[PDB]
C-alpha cells in the first residue's frame, strides 16, 4: 500500500519545489 497518499505527497512537494514527496513513519518529507 503506502502511508502517505501519492497523489497528495508528490502533488504537494513538487508545487513547493522539490524532485519527489515521500513516508518515512512520521510525515511526508519532500526532497
Known amino acids: ?3 502517505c497518499q ?3 505527497c ?3 512537494c ?3 519545489g522539490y524532485r519527489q ?3 518515512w513513519g ?3 518529507q519532500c526532497y
Open 26 to 28: 512520521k510525515y511526508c
Open 1 to 3: 500500500g503506502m502511508a
Open 10 to 12: 508528490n502533488s504537494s
Open 6 to 8: 501519492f497523489w497528495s
Open 21 to 23: 514527496g515521500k513516508c
Open 14 to 16: 513538487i508545487s513547493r
